[PDB]
Symmetry: C2
Subunit: 654 residues, 2 copies
């Protein structure tokens, strides 16, 4: 049944670094042969491609590091995902998944299987075990994995109820070593929930998936790319303001990269993560000094980065894009932001991928600053080269701020600033907003770390060994804010609440003209107004639209994890405990912007909740609609009756 399919899906993720020792899994893997049948998949091309990869010494063996930002790794993972996705029936998909689990590389199998599960018509609504639990090596410092393995080695017969079911109290990166100050925001950048958010966003909309083939173009994906990255940057800026940090550092490709990253994580094969030192020179000569290369295109990541940056600048200035036809494509269309997002991201929907390329891929390779692989099968990728650990690197935020500057330039040059009438909602007036005291504190979070040790077959079958990891994760006391609206008739409005800063780290007031980009979508719902006075009450545990529209969320929770506050993986999901940025004992001061507008339903492609169905969104206004473009008159945003600015102090206790 659906419950049994869910349980089997979860079973498939146990002890990924080891072969599946379940009897059914072993039998299925040893007896099944995808190429032998070759008829149960909707397409024979996908199976033929995967067979070509698998047989003729062009496949990533078990035990090798997998990176989705390496070309051949990506090609093989795509082939496996297509094999999983084009299974005519779920039974064939399960047999293929079991075989791949037992035979295909661990990281490659995990990525292909996850993308298939979120994207398959049948298994879209399947919950997935938290990634930080499945593959913990990417989420905890090696001082935690090594301690878990200490307990595992010591747990043998003697000393019962000792070295078992033990809680490892992990610290964040800067506890032991005095790492670079930017890594002081380690409890946020290295939070398992935030990295899970980024990883699940990339699972939902992979940078290599084509919107024509996989229906991701009905979700725009360019506006998604832009809005998701801008919201991540804005939430990071809010956290930095909380901790007294300033705006994210600006960096030049031609100046030594002033920031260094010292990861504390380790690969399951005993290989430590690459380290980027302070003031690292990013030039071909310096970042390939003392290396072989010769036929590695990533060795020249600097020249490719400069080329793609130049091309993006040119297309944004002109507003005219080059296509394979070499013709003139208008970028001023209604969906010009979408075209720009596809162009910059590098997804198969890019106007000309050969010309604009994957700027982010080469930027991550260069800023990761690790040795170029001697061979395909001997690769040493950095944090920036994985989705699960990208947010841990400050260079991640600096790189994507450099990217979003391009979108800001496009909007500034080609978008007309909103006037009073465009934002006006005649007959609606937000009288005042009351928000309960916003308090943020730290609490311990317990996660099943047992997947980081090597279990014996009996232990595997019975899960006898248990080892937890406890981590201080920011949490907030539940709050409920009220919105009072005085309408003129029974209209159907859309309410959009934003969270942004009012004062910078130096206490200076930030004008909306230089502050529109720092606003974080706090809630985005639809309310049916009535003539006269209305009161809108919203709880903290009812907000599912943080920095992202998730309208069909919680119906998947009520089914999969609804058989509380359990890692969803449904849509993207920002941690409910990280919604409010850390405050101060005195209370760092932010402001909430409340907006109300008439309903504009989105062009939903289909009713079924699914990636690419278009059912995600609330309204058809541009994402972050009031602040999606530069603001030329702050007093205009203050004077709108259907708007309201309200100031709150978030209090940190601990």
């Amino acid at each position: 049944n659906y419950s049994q399919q869910q349980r089997d899906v979860w079973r498939l993720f146990k002890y990924i670094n080891q072969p599946s020792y379940y009897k059914d899994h072993v039998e299925i893997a040893h007896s099944y042969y995808f190429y032998d049948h070759a008829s149960n998949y909707a397409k024979h091309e996908v199976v033929e491609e995967f067979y070509r990869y698998f047989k003729y010494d062009t496949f990533l063996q078990r035990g090798e590091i997998f990176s989705v930002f390496h070309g051949e790794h990506l090609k093989q993972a795509i082939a496996l995902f297509k094999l999983f996705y084009y299974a005519n029936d779920f039974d064939t998909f399960y047999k293929t998944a079991v075989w791949a689990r037992q035979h295909v590389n661990e990281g490659m199998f995990l990525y292909a299987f996850s993308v298939a599960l979120i994207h398959r018509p049948d298994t879209y609504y399947f919950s997935l075990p938290p990634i930080y639990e499945i593959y913990p090596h990417y989420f905890y410092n090696y001082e935690v994995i090594q301690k878990a393995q200490h307990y595992k080695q010591m747990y043998y017969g003697q000393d019962g109820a000792h070295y078992n079911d033990r809680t490892i109290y992990a610290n964040y990166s800067g506890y032991y070593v005095n790492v670079y100050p930017e890594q002081a925001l380690a409890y946020f950048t290295e939070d398992v929930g935030v990295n899970s958010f980024y990883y699940y966003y990339n699972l939902y909309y992979p940078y290599w998936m084509s919107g024509e083939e996989f229906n991701l173009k009905y979700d725009n994906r360019g506006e998604i790319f832009y809005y998701m990255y801008q919201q991540i940057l804005a939430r990071y800026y809010l956290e930095r303001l909380s901790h007294g940090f300033g705006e994210i550092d600006h960096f030049d490709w031609e100046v030594p990269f002033e920031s260094g990253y010292y990861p504390s994580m380790c690969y399951p094969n005993g290989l430590y993560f690459p380290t980027r030192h302070a003031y690292a020179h990013l030039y071909e000569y310096f970042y390939n000094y003392g290396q072989h290369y010769g036929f590695n295109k990533y060795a020249h990541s600097y020249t490719h980065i400069s080329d793609y940056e130049r091309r993006i600048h040119d297309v944004i200035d002109s507003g005219y894009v080059h296509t394979h036809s070499g013709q003139k494509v208008d970028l001023f269309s209604h969906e010009g932001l979408d075209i720009l997002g596809n162009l910059i991201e590098g997804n198969p929907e890019s106007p000309y991928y050969h010309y604009y390329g994957a700027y982010q891929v080469f930027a991550r390779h260069l800023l990761g600053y690790s040795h170029q692989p001697l061979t395909f099968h001997k690769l040493h990728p950095s944090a920036l080269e994985h989705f699960e650990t990208s947010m841990r690197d400050p260079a991640f935020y600096q790189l994507y701020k450099k990217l979003l500057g391009f979108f800001f330039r496009y909007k500034s040059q080609h978008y007309h600033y909103y006037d009073e009438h465009d934002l006006a909602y005649h007959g609606v007036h937000v009288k005042h907003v009351e928000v309960d005291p916003l308090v943020t504190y730290f609490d311990y979070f317990y996660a099943d770390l047992s997947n980081a040790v090597y279990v014996t077959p009996e232990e595997f079958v019975h899960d006898s060994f248990k080892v937890h990891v406890a981590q201080e994760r920011l949490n907030h006391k539940p709050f409920t804010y009220k919105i009072y609206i005085d309408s003129d008739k029974d209209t159907e409005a859309v309410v959009k609440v934003f969270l942004g800063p009012k004062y910078d780290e130096y206490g200076r007031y930030i004008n909306l003209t230089e502050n529109w980009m720092n606003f974080v979508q706090f809630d985005h719902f639809v309310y049916k107004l009535k003539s006269g006075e209305n009161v809108i009450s919203r709880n903290s545990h009812e907000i599912y639209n943080y920095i992202h529209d998730r309208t069909s969320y919680y119906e998947l929770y009520q089914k999969a994890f609804g058989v509380q506050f359990h890692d969803n993986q449904f849509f993207f999901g920002f941690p409910q405990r990280y919604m409010l940025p850390r405050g101060s004992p005195e209370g760092m001061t932010y402001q909430f912007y409340v907006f109300v507008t008439k309903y504009h339903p989105y062009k939903a492609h289909a009713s079924v909740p699914m990636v690419g169905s278009g059912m995600h969104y609330v309204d058809a206004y541009p994402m972050g609609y009031p602040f999606d473009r530069p603001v030329y008159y702050e007093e205009l945003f203050y004077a709108l009756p259907n708007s309201y600015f309200q100031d709150v102090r978030i209090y940190y206790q601990g």
Copy 2:
């Protein structure tokens, strides 16, 4: 009388940038002739030297910038000070002062006159008008001086009670321009009181005054140099911790100076203060690029700095000093810290001035980073080259931290860490300490800015024009702390209270081993204990021993300014309103260390309160006695019964 002499002394300081238009002053200057008499001064050599300077085109004319860190400026100022000081009777001193006022350069006259007044036997107890009022061009941005001159130009007959007695609301450096972040602590570094403190300290113990000739060796001057600069650095560090800043930046002479200084002040001759840009190269070539020099020793300030730093390193490592005899002088004596202070400072008491030189002079010249003077009479000095504006430059604090590192090295290598017995005070026990809530806030301070404009003779005589400047200066609510001591007999003890940080800017606990240098002397008094329980009550308005022992203070206040909270100028004087570092709304957390010890009277050379008389001090223990040397066991300082650590939160309101 004494009151009339005080009033005449104050009159001498009115409108320094202009000739004295008082009738008596003009008559005295025009009729008097110091060389004509040549007998009223105790020495004919001083008058002959000043005459040689004054006549034969080797004197600094009126209207030229004066810098005490220029060799020939310093020589001329010394000659004038010696002329003022060796006046056999006060009447001759007054006639000479009037003549110099009307004829000698303004800055040179002001410096020589002030040093003479603080150092003369007769006029030691004379109060002096606040320096920030006498010569405001060194204490306020030019946007204030130009506005005062606007009012002065507009104030002519018409528009009465308008453009007169006007209050100019001045802002600190970073209000208009987005200057380098280190200048964010502008309300402290640019506070008139703090700069007055430094200027008056340098008036009291000039770097060129000989302790043999002027009795400054009975005040050690080396321990004074060290302790004053260390306490200034520690108070600055406390302020930085308050504002979230860290430890003072360390800089290498061989790396570009990463910090830049943009002063907003202007010279009275319309010349703007030199600016040091970010990442300034300090090498001979770079900081003399495009300049003439050729016979300016300060052009090679870098080589001299390196030489003197090398010599200081060598003497501290060896502990053996080179003298004109070229012999071996023990630096391990009881007064070895004094010898080291004289050696580093460069005062005439230096063991061999030719060999160790004035490291601070050349360091200030190099870090000031201004054009080398084309001529003696055309000089463009920086903030670091004046005593009144040194503390405004972050390079000041970085330079003197680099200096005090030398003393730290000397103490670490050659001083034995205190044990339990050395610090023990048997029979004394500090039970607990109660300190009232420490609250710091901002208030407006009004200073007479009228000395920055050019008045007509009638206006000069009647002081018709009045223009004030209002500035937000940190102030604290009055507090009273209690110290409970349980003694065994009626002993006579010395109480030493220190203020230092407990947590750094990142919330980490600072161990005493790395925290002994950050403790600021809060109070240092003597109490006559009694057998059994004692309670010591001390008010905030009774503390005169902040970062400096001033035992004979307030008897000069009760006479000169006692005919409240008026700028003293007596001894050094840390502003009473800046005693408590700025807190936070949540409350930045510091700690008070309370120490009690048996009385060790200082070797007072004379009873009369005076510079060089030795009457300044309380006890004969080394300055900052508990923390004058590195701490090898913090638990030792915690375990001493006669000690006590108490934690306080200082609350910022505003």
